[PDB]
Design a protein around this ligand. Structure first.
Ligand SMILES: OC[C@H]1O[C@@H](S[C@H]2[C@H](O)[C@@H](O)[C@H](S[C@H]3[C@H](O)[C@@H](O)[C@H](S[C@H]4[C@H](O)[C@@H](O)[C@H](O)O[C@@H]4CO)O[C@@H]3CO)O[C@@H]2CO)[C@H](O)[C@@H](O)[C@@H]1O
Ligand SMILES: *[C@@H]1O[C@H](CO)[C@@H](O[C@@H]2O[C@H](CO)[C@@H](O)[C@H](O)[C@H]2NC(C)=O)[C@H](O)[C@H]1NC(C)=O
Ligand SMILES: OC[C@H]1O[C@@H](S[C@H]2[C@H](O)[C@@H](O)[C@H](O)O[C@@H]2CO)[C@H](O)[C@@H](O)[C@@H]1O
Ligand code: NAG
Ligand code: NAG
Length: 438
């Protein structure tokens, strides 16, 4: 994709901290950038759209290469169009913005400078942030996560990609998404079909695969921490159903792990721990600490989670499911959880902890998003039962308190139009350097 010249692109400033063993902390001047899919995409020779709603202009985009030559991503009005506001160390994302037209959700990335994403290697470190999920009801997901996107957005070896990280180009994840307009320096017009339900989306012939660390997927009801492995941790292109992932007819047939090794306190049997008025009280802001412990070789062997609220350090809840113990993500936990729940261990199949180690060594980009779910209504995160016809007595079926009929986008895009998430006070450093409390 090309650089559009009709609207200035100014990345909202966002500060975040680096801490050392001490724990003294200093402030980094980061910037955030909107993902390329949300942008106006128009001809390089004027204002004619290359894509509108769910449909490509086939004169501008007769094939994937020509489309990339002809089409430019332009600047974004972060607050006015997308409901994205950055102030100091806080980033607020609104679910619905009624601008000149309606916008639903957003996905953003943390930038080092105007043309490069910040990258992270969290091995033997922790990543910490504050979040307010009080405005997120059933069906919403404020996701803060990491994927090994190219720091430059792919421009170095993609001649038809001039827009790069400056315009939020280069996304990939463990679902191998085919709804992306640009993948690896080419458009995705070939094979495009508009979505059956969403007016804003569709699926092209190709998907964008990579490893994925879901540090945080949550609303006010439930939260999940989920690493996902991949054969190749950085971006690869896939085609059609062979992609695997959410919008494939053969979910597990691809080169990535679309399920991950998840820890949701509620799904792991503790329904008193996370939610409204619970131990981690989602009515108010809290701190989320995620630690990435290594073995003697420097390979990831454990992900620990702590919360801090009202000045109290709260260890992650113990899994209470018979056969699945502990309160952290380890190989023992992942093996046990998949065996006991009767889920395919695609996490292990695509390299598990070694894959995530390799993802960190490649360099992870921080993603902050807010979305609803046109595939499964977020029921996998927050439903009394997922699948909806499964027995709630069966371990692993219950994930939250939301009804099986909750979270339908056409419903919640009206009823939850006030929804929002605020991520703030990001801190990164050695283990135990980013937080304190009793
Ligand atoms: O065309 C003008 C029209 O544009 C919309 S903006 C619109 C984009 O055009 C469209 O490409 C994307 S598709 C988007 C999808 O809606 C969203 O549900 C998923 S959420 C995704 C999440 O971000 C990730 O964090 C998570 O890991 O996976 C989730 C599921 O994939 O992302 C898709 C893109 O990758 O949708 C936007 C918004 O509808 C303007 O809003 C509108 O006003 C204008 O008329
Ligand atoms: C991206 O997906 C498109 C659409 O499926 C692929 O397009 C096919 O490409 C082959 C080889 O060039 C052609 O023979 C077919 O005619 C194309 N099919 C269609 C429907 O257009 C394309 O190959 C994919 N790109 C990559 C890099 O995998
Ligand atoms: O595909 C949507 C959603 O999937 C989860 S994995 C999910 C499986 O889909 C389900 O079969 C099993 O019973 O539960 C697991 C865990 O919830 C994945 O973690 C997530 O990334 C994705 O959005
Ligand atoms: C597609 O783009 C061409 C070239 O700019 C333009 O002439 C035409 O009106 C557009 N067609 C549609 C259907 O948008
Ligand atoms: C960090 O603190 C946690 C919780 O208090 C403790 O379990 C752990 O031993 C500490 N780790 C280090 C490296 O100090």
């Amino acid at each position: 994709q090309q650089i559009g010249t009709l609207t200035t692109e100014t990345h909202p400033p966002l500060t975040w901290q680096t801490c050392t063993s001490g724990g003294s902390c200093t402030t980094n001047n980061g910037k955030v950038v909107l993902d390329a899919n949300w942008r106006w995409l128009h001809s390089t020779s004027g204002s004619t759209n290359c894509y509108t709603g769910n449909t490509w202009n086939t004169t501008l985009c007769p094939d994937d290469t020509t489309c990339a030559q002809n089409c430019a991503l332009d600047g974004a009005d972060y607050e006015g169009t997308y409901g994205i506001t950055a102030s100091g160390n806080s980033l607020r994302l609104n679910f619905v913005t009624n601008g000149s037209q309606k916008n639903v959700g957003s996905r953003t990335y943390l930038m080092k400078d105007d043309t490069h994403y910040q990258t992270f290697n969290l091995l033997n470190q922790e990543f910490t942030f504050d979040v307010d999920v009080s405005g997120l009801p059933c069906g919403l997901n404020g996701a803060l996560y990491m994927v090994p996107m190219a720091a430059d957005g792919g421009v170095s070896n993609e001649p038809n990609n001039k827009a790069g990280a400056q315009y939020g180009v280069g996304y990939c994840d463990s679902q191998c998404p085919r709804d992306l307009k640009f993948i690896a320096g080419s458009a995705n017009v070939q094979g495009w079909e508009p979505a059956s339900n969403s007016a804003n989306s569709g699926l092209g012939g190709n998907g964008s695969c990579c490893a994925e660390l879901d540090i945080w997927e949550a609303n006010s009801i439930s939260a999940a921490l989920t690493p996902h492995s991949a054969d190749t941790v950085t971006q690869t292109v896939c085609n059609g159903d062979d992609c695997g992932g959410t919008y494939s007819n053969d979910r597990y047939s691809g080169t990535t792990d679309p399920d991950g090794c998840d820890f949701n306190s509620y799904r792991q049997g503790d329904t008193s721990f996370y939610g409204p008025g619970k131990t981690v009280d989602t009515n108010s802001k809290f701190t989320v600490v995620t630690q990435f412990l290594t073995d003697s070789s420097g390979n990831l062997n454990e992900i620990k989670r702590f919360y801090v609220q009202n000045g109290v350090v709260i260890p992650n809840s113990q899994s209470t499911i018979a056969g699945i113990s502990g309160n952290s993500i380890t190989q023992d936990y992942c093996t046990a959880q998949k065996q006991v729940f009767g889920d395919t261990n695609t996490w292990e199949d695509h390299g598990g902890f070694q894959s995530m180690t390799n993802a960190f060594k490649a360099g992870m980009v921080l993603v902050m998003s807010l979305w609803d779910d046109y595939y499964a209504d977020m029921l996998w995160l927050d439903s009394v039962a997922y699948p909806t016809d499964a027995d709630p007595s069966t371990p692993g079926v219950a994930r939250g308190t939301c009804s099986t009929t909750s979270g339908v986008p056409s419903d919640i895009e009206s009823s939850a139009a006030s929804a929002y998430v605020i991520y703030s006070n990001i801190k990164v450093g050695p283990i135990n350097s980013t937080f304190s409390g009793t």
